[PDB]
Scaffold this motif. Structure first.
Motif, short mmCIF file in Angstrom:
data_model
loop_
_atom_site.label_atom_id
_atom_site.label_comp_id
_atom_site.label_asym_id
_atom_site.label_seq_id
_atom_site.Cartn_x
_atom_site.Cartn_y
_atom_site.Cartn_z
N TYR A 9 17.56 0.26 7.04
CA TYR A 9 16.31 -0.40 7.45
C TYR A 9 16.01 -1.67 6.69
O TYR A 9 15.26 -2.50 7.18
N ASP A 10 16.58 -1.84 5.50
CA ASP A 10 16.13 -2.89 4.60
C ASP A 10 17.09 -4.07 4.52
O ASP A 10 17.30 -4.65 3.46
N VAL A 11 17.59 -4.45 5.69
CA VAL A 11 18.51 -5.56 5.88
C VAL A 11 18.13 -6.26 7.20
O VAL A 11 17.53 -5.65 8.10
N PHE A 49 8.80 -6.10 14.30
CA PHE A 49 10.06 -6.45 15.00
C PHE A 49 11.26 -5.63 14.60
O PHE A 49 12.41 -6.01 14.89
N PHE A 50 11.02 -4.51 13.94
CA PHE A 50 12.08 -3.54 13.68
C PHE A 50 12.63 -2.95 14.97
O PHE A 50 11.89 -2.67 15.92
N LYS A 51 13.95 -2.71 14.99
CA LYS A 51 14.58 -2.00 16.10
C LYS A 51 14.10 -0.54 16.05
O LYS A 51 13.66 -0.09 14.99
N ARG A 73 3.43 3.05 -4.78
CA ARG A 73 2.88 2.63 -3.50
C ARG A 73 3.67 3.16 -2.29
O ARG A 73 3.08 3.64 -1.32
N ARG A 74 5.00 3.06 -2.35
CA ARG A 74 5.86 3.50 -1.28
C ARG A 74 5.63 4.95 -0.97
O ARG A 74 5.58 5.31 0.19
N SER A 75 5.47 5.78 -2.00
CA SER A 75 5.25 7.23 -1.81
C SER A 75 3.91 7.54 -1.14
O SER A 75 3.75 8.59 -0.53
N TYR A 100 6.25 6.09 6.80
CA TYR A 100 6.90 5.23 7.77
C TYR A 100 7.33 6.09 8.91
O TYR A 100 7.31 7.36 8.82
N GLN A 101 7.75 5.44 9.99
CA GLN A 101 8.38 6.13 11.11
C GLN A 101 9.73 5.52 11.39
O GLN A 101 9.79 4.40 11.91
N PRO A 102 10.84 6.23 11.03
CA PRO A 102 10.94 7.56 10.37
C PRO A 102 10.49 7.55 8.93
O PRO A 102 10.45 6.48 8.31
N1 NNR Z 1 8.33 -0.43 10.93
C1 NNR Z 1 9.44 0.29 11.04
O1 NNR Z 1 10.04 0.47 12.08
C2 NNR Z 1 10.00 0.89 9.73
C3 NNR Z 1 10.69 2.09 9.75
C4 NNR Z 1 11.20 2.64 8.58
C5 NNR Z 1 11.03 1.98 7.37
N2 NNR Z 1 10.31 0.76 7.33
C6 NNR Z 1 10.12 0.04 6.04
O2 NNR Z 1 9.27 -1.14 6.23
C7 NNR Z 1 9.55 -1.91 5.02
C8 NNR Z 1 9.15 -3.42 5.21
O3 NNR Z 1 8.24 -3.52 6.28
C9 NNR Z 1 11.07 -1.72 4.73
O4 NNR Z 1 11.27 -1.44 3.35
C10 NNR Z 1 11.48 -0.53 5.61
O5 NNR Z 1 12.28 0.48 4.89
C11 NNR Z 1 9.81 0.22 8.53
#
Ligand code: NNR
Ligand code: ANP
Ligand code: MG
Length: 179
Positions: free
Chosen positions: A57-59, A40-42, A120-122, A126-128
């Motif tokens: 993105y993290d709000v 459900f991200f924009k 893990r994050r690395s 993601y997109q972007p």
């Molecule tokens: N799914 C997305 O649209 C998207 C895009 C960029 C970053 N993220 C990361 O997803 C994590 C939680 O699902 C967050 O920490 C976002 O930064 C998601």
């Protein structure tokens, strides 16, 4: 309305294994749906950027929470037609979103160290993609904002160690749920 339901919230820091745990639970529970906040991200075109040029993105403002709330409401409205229906809602920003406070029958929070979280994050794309210094510049600070927003929570949250294996995490929640 019309049947008993059982709603589980699973949140935690990014890459704590929330999506994997939800999916694993759904595989082994009957009449179990999963709604993922990740869906459900924009689109990037609608995301803000802050003073230091980091995409925000993290709000909660990065997400269509009306659309997610709609899906959750629709699950509840339609649950009785499927017959205890189970809903797992999983996402990194759940327990600071007041409309959901009263819905939870069980609430779990996955925690991992900063170093392991960064590691893990690395491994993810993601997109972007994460911009350089995004994790220290945006992700971890916003995660701490969340945790402190969570200080006002009045219900019980079960904190789980996300460095346990995927199977141990499943089993730990599963054992809890059938109890
Ligand atoms: N799914 C997305 O649209 C998207 C895009 C960029 C970053 N993220 C990361 O997803 C994590 C939680 O699902 C967050 O920490 C976002 O930064 C998601
Ligand atoms: N319990 C675990 N132990 C070790 N690695 C895991 C575990 N759970 C998930 N992972 C790995 O960690 C990464 C993210 O798992 P995932 O289930 O997507 O986490 P998430 O919290 O939903 N991620 P995100 O939505 O992007 O914030 C993937 O590489 C998984 O294979
Ligand atoms: Mg996820």
């Amino acid at each position: 309305r019309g049947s008993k339901t059982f709603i589980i919230g699973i949140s935690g820091v990014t890459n704590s294994g929330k999506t994997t745990l939800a999916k694993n639970l759904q595989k082994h529970l009957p009449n179990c749906s999963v709604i993922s906040q990740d869906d459900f991200f924009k689109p990037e075109s609608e995301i803000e950027t802050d003073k230091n040029g980091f995409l925000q993105y993290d709000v909660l403002e990065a997400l269509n929470m009306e659309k997610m709330m709609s899906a959750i409401s629709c699950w509840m409205e339609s649950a009785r037609h499927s017959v205890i229906p189970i809903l797992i809602i999983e996402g990194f920003l759940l327990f600071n979103y007041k409309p959901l406070d009263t819905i939870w029958n069980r609430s779990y929070f996955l925690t991992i160290p900063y170093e392991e979280c960064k590691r893990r994050r690395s491994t993810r794309v993601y997109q972007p993609p994460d911009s350089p210094g995004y994790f220290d510049g945006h992700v971890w600070p916003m995660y701490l904002k969340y945790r402190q927003e969570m200080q006002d929570i009045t219900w019980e949250v079960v904190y789980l160690d996300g460095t346990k294996s995927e199977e141990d995490l499943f089993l730990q929640v599963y054992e809890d749920l059938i109890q």
